[PDB]
Design a protein around this nucleic acid. Structure first.
Ligand SMILES: [Mg+2]
Ligand SMILES: [Mg+2]
Ligand SMILES: [Mg+2]
Ligand SMILES: [Mg+2]
Ligand SMILES: [Mg+2]
Ligand SMILES: [Mg+2]
Ligand SMILES: [Mg+2]
Ligand SMILES: [Mg+2]
Ligand SMILES: [Mg+2]
Ligand SMILES: [Mg+2]
Ligand SMILES: [Mg+2]
Ligand SMILES: [Mg+2]
Ligand SMILES: [Mg+2]
Ligand SMILES: [Mg+2]
Ligand SMILES: [Mg+2]
Ligand SMILES: [Mg+2]
Ligand SMILES: [Mg+2]
Ligand SMILES: [Mg+2]
Ligand SMILES: [Mg+2]
Ligand SMILES: [Mg+2]
Ligand SMILES: [Mg+2]
Ligand SMILES: [Mg+2]
Ligand SMILES: [Mg+2]
Ligand SMILES: [Mg+2]
Ligand SMILES: [Mg+2]
Ligand SMILES: [Mg+2]
Ligand SMILES: [Mg+2]
Ligand SMILES: [Mg+2]
Ligand SMILES: [Mg+2]
Ligand SMILES: [Mg+2]
Ligand SMILES: [Mg+2]
Ligand SMILES: [Mg+2]
Ligand SMILES: [Mg+2]
Ligand SMILES: [Mg+2]
Ligand SMILES: [Mg+2]
Ligand SMILES: [Mg+2]
Ligand SMILES: [Mg+2]
Ligand SMILES: [Mg+2]
Ligand SMILES: [Mg+2]
Ligand SMILES: [Mg+2]
Ligand SMILES: [Mg+2]
Ligand SMILES: [Mg+2]
Ligand SMILES: [Mg+2]
Ligand SMILES: [Mg+2]
Ligand SMILES: [Mg+2]
Lengths: 143, 58, 206, 171, 98
RNA sequence: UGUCUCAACGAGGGACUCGGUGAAAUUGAAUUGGCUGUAAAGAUGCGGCCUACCCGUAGCAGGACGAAAAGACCCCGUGGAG
RNA sequence: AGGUUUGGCACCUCGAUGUCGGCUCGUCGCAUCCUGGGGCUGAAGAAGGUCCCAAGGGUUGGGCUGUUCGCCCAUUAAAGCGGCACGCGAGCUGGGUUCAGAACGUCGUGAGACAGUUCGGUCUCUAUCCGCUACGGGCGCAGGAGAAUUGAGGGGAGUUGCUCC
RNA sequence: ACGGAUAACCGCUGAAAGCAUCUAAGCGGGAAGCCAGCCCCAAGAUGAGUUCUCCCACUGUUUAUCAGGUAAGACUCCCGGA
């Protein structure tokens, strides 16, 4: 008998990232995209929101992390793959840094991959999705 | 039901821990967690339940 | 940088101050500028140059209007050259200077499905002392259960030849400009009558 | 490594943020500054001090004081290290804005000084690097010393002019 | 939003049958009167035992048996299967109350 | 002297394509990836993470503790036989 | 510390997990044989010693022996040490040890035995799945078509001597 | 080759610790190694990208509701191919 909403709603949102610790902005984006906020209604449905991260280049990385953080990736080849990038090599492509954090804090299933579709990252303070006029968010909740 | 209930609780600046306890402190409401959800489909009420839990807690 | 298109004509014997020189003859027939790629319009700088002519009876309407917007006769072949900004049309004239080193790109002669000895220089097994692994036949591909797959990128029987190929820093022996002939030292990839690109030596010497 | 700053007559200072720009007789300069402390009043001599008798502070106390000190010592006075080529046939030349090292390598050596730093030589066997920033003149002179460190056995190389150097016994 | 919550329910859905654990109240004889933890019977509602000062009567409608089920138990490697039929009774109650 | 450095070219008979006839061993069922970890101690099948569109054809033999013979070694049976 | 030796223990495998060496094919560690960079030296130069960083690539051909090793010849920048079921027999050898024949030495009255030594002695045409190399068919990529293309990402390559200034 | 960031290491500026100190803030130098540069592959990068050009608004009553004649353009077939 529990209510099961239909979801005509699309919900655009514009999160700034300058100075926010990466994991923290990550968790806020992952929560807002997975549902959570608002009564979650069905886990079955991707009823979360579209996030539009901007200034992703400016993310703070408090502590030694800026050059300690070694993102690692493995090419099929059994020649040694496992290439690694410093995160100070967010200069190569800062959106990847953001997009990696978020996808970690999302489900890993069919629906989760489908969720990664709802993240849009732009390292600069600009974006092309003006047509959806996203609502601004803040960054942290209060007791 | 828990997910939806503290989703609504955070819509007003509370949270499941806080809202459920404050409702418990208010002459024990004893609504089921099922029932508190549905009042998260009827927002004007869940709102007053939030103000009531916020009371028995100040 | 500098670039042009031509057909591979063949290799012969030559002399320059009593040094016998093998040479490949190439026809760097005049090329036309069909398209100009600005970055401001196509995101990067390049030029689309054409080569072997063909009669408009064989040229379908879309390609016809392509060539037509640029004012050029239809060409069986088109290619881009990065960073070129030529003018008029790209003749081999002066574009290469005698004695330059140049990057010659062509297409390996297609050798079909070669074994391991031909393809990767395996040097398979002994021809006596007692096998049925005489010919190619690689020995092992793995090591028991240890990862228990065979490695990705393993060398194996396959399609040999037919590759793109570049050979860098061949020397420009001679230029018969009016014939549109360019004489280059040494070998070039692919069979006679084939397409080849000559471009400015990409790894210019110090 | 603390104490009051001195203010020569041809100087100015601004206490905004951690910014600290000076406009002394040889030109303007700036010294980066931790903002956890506040930059002090310019009324005559100036000193900044640590909020806490804590360990981590007084280190920055001394570093910040001495840094502003040397910045003033430069903008008001100037800076200039001396250097002495030493060893058979070692010498240098000035060629435009660059130094012409000529000391025991098959290739004569050149050095172009980063901005604001002036090479000079009078005696062909002696260099002098003048400038405004002290860290800059330090790294420049350290480069010219890098071109050849004096050898342990015989003392060939770049020297400080006043630089005594003991030497190993050879045979 | 009416709520058979748990065993005795307290929510505003005026006028309809619904199923409950049972009663003993034969036929329609029950006319069971109900507590009330909160219902919106006129937009307005309350909980603070002011709901208890309200009550909703309900006619009983009829007793019934739920759908059949088979309890099934199994554990690996030890033989041990168990098949057993079950279905739980209920009382259907119409609502009318304040 | 092709055994070899060190393999080449050529021949025929297969292998490949089309039309005719058409088996076999094997097969708990299968919608049957990589790393690392854990598990009765060598994981497609458990955990985490990565990678990966559907389906074939020609080929290679690392895995499927691949197939074949209820280990011939070893021990055991108050077993057997020469 | 490591887990490459001999071992302990006996945990899966005795309705079978083929074992030495060679060949073939590779790939990984680094506790580095060569090359590259450094400190110190009882480092003048040259030639070295030893420790620190470093795993890109490289690391020869023969005689003897089944050998692995090891000794030797003649070179070399160097002629590294280990893992991968002491990697690799549905990939090959089958020289070695674990079947039947036969002989010597030895032991046993014998039948027979071995720490041994010696000559001889069947290595199973068809790949289902996964993994790999090559090659197509389908659909997708918000109209249907012909061409030119950015490069997210991925692979290959990566050694070294000698002489001369 | 050039270039960027690094290892051991070598230094500048320098407090704590009125001297000293390469480090505690900061900065430069520094390898066959790392990233880029060279060659090859690559948008099934389902996040499927970009550019030039071509063809264009056809037809069928509530009955067959999507299909059918065609355009641009391919494909079958034929003769051949480093
Ligand atoms: Mg061919
Ligand atoms: Mg051979
Ligand atoms: Mg095997
Ligand atoms: Mg595996
Ligand atoms: Mg079970
Ligand atoms: Mg049991
Ligand atoms: Mg043949
Ligand atoms: Mg599958
Ligand atoms: Mg474990
Ligand atoms: Mg495992
Ligand atoms: Mg499962
Ligand atoms: Mg798994
Ligand atoms: Mg895919
Ligand atoms: Mg086979
Ligand atoms: Mg078996
Ligand atoms: Mg048995
Ligand atoms: Mg008996
Ligand atoms: Mg052991
Ligand atoms: Mg036991
Ligand atoms: Mg079995
Ligand atoms: Mg054995
Ligand atoms: Mg080491
Ligand atoms: Mg050395
Ligand atoms: Mg020496
Ligand atoms: Mg040898
Ligand atoms: Mg002999
Ligand atoms: Mg090895
Ligand atoms: Mg062993
Ligand atoms: Mg083995
Ligand atoms: Mg076999
Ligand atoms: Mg034998
Ligand atoms: Mg006797
Ligand atoms: Mg015989
Ligand atoms: Mg034999
Ligand atoms: Mg056959
Ligand atoms: Mg289109
Ligand atoms: Mg790339
Ligand atoms: Mg991919
Ligand atoms: Mg110092
Ligand atoms: Mg540094
Ligand atoms: Mg540097
Ligand atoms: Mg080199
Ligand atoms: Mg799409
Ligand atoms: Mg249609
Ligand atoms: Mg037509």
């Amino acid at each position: 008998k529990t209510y099961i909403p239909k979801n005509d709603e699309q919900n655009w949102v514009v999160v700034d990232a300058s100075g926010v610790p990466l994991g923290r902005l990550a968790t806020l984006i992952a929560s807002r995209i997975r549902g959570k906020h608002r009564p979650d209604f069905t886990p079955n449905m991707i009823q979360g929101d579209f996030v539009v991260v901007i200034n992703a280049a400016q993310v703070a990385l408090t502590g030694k992390k800026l050059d300690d953080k070694v993102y690692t990736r493995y090419t099929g080849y059994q020649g040694g793959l496992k290439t690694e990038t410093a995160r100070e090599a967010l200069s190569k492509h800062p959106e990847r840094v953001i997009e990696h954090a978020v996808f970690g804090m999302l489900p890993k299933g069919r629906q989760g991959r489908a969720m990664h579709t709802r993240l849009k990252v732009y390292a600069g303070e600009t974006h092309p999705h003006s047509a959806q006029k996203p609502q601004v968010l803040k960054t942290q909740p209060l007791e | 039901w828990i997910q939806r209930i503290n989703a609504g609780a955070r819509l007003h600046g509370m949270n499941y821990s806080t809202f459920i306890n404050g409702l418990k402190r208010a002459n024990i409401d004893l609504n089921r967690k099922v029932l508190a959800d549905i009042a998260a489909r009827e927002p004007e009420a869940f709102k007053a339940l939030v103000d009531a839990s916020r009371n028995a807690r100040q | 940088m500098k670039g042009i298109l031509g057909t591979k004509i063949g290799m012969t014997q030559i002399w320059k101050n009593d040094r016998a020189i093998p040479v490949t003859v190439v026809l760097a027939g005049p090329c036309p500028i069909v398209q100009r790629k600005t970055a401001q319009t196509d995101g990067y700088e390049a030029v689309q140059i054409g080569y072997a002519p063909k009669a408009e009876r064989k040229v379908n309407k879309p390609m016809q209007g392509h060539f037509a917007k640029a004012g050029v006769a239809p060409t069986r072949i088109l290619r881009e050259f990065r960073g070129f900004a030529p003018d008029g049309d790209s003749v081999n004239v002066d574009i290469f200077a005698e004695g330059e080193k140049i990057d010659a790109t062509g297409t390996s002669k297609g050798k079909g499905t070669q074994g391991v000895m031909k393809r990767w220089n395996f040097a398979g097994g002994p021809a006596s002392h007692g096998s049925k692994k005489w010919h190619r036949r690689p020995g092992s591909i793995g090591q028991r259960k240890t990862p228990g797959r065979v490695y990705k990128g393993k060398r194996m029987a396959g399609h040999m030849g037919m590759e793109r190929v570049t050979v860098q820093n061949l020397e420009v022996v001679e230029i018969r400009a009016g014939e549109n002939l360019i004489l280059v030292k040494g070998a070039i990839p692919g069979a006679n009558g084939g397409l080849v690109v000559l471009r400015s030596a990409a790894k210019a010497s110090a | 490594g603390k104490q009051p700053i001195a203010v020569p007559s041809g100087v100015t200072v601004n206490a905004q943020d951690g910014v600290f720009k000076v406009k002394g007789p040889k030109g303007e300069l700036t010294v980066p500054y931790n903002t956890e402390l506040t930059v002090r009043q310019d009324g005559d001599q100036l000193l900044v001090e640590r909020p806490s008798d804590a360990q981590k502070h007084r280190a920055l106390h001394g570093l910040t004081r001495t840094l502003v000190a040397n910045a003033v010592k430069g903008v008001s006075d100037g800076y200039t290290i001396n250097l002495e080529l030493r060893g058979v046939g070692f010498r240098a030349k000035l060629t435009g804005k660059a130094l012409e090292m000529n000391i025991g390598y098959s290739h004569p050596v050149i050095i172009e000084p980063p901005a604001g730093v002036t090479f000079a030589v009078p005696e062909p066997t002696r260099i002098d690097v003048s400038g405004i920033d002290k860290q800059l003149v330090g790294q420049v002179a350290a480069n010219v010393r890098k071109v050849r460190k004096p050898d342990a056995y015989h003392g060939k190389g770049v020297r400080f002019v006043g630089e005594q150097i003991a030497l190993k016994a050879g045979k | 939003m009416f709520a058979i919550i748990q065993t005795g329910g307290k929510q505003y859905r005026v006028s309809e049958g619904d199923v409950i654990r049972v009663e003993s109240l034969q036929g329609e004889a029950g006319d069971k009167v109900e507590l009330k933890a909160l219902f919106v019977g006129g937009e307005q509602t309350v909980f603070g035992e002011d709901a208890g000062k309200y009550t909703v009567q309900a006619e009983v409608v009829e007793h019934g048996r739920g759908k059949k089920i088979y309890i099934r138990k199994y554990k690996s490697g030890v033989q041990y299967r168990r098949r057993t039929g079950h279905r739980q009774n209920f009382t259907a109650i119409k609502i009318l109350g304040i």
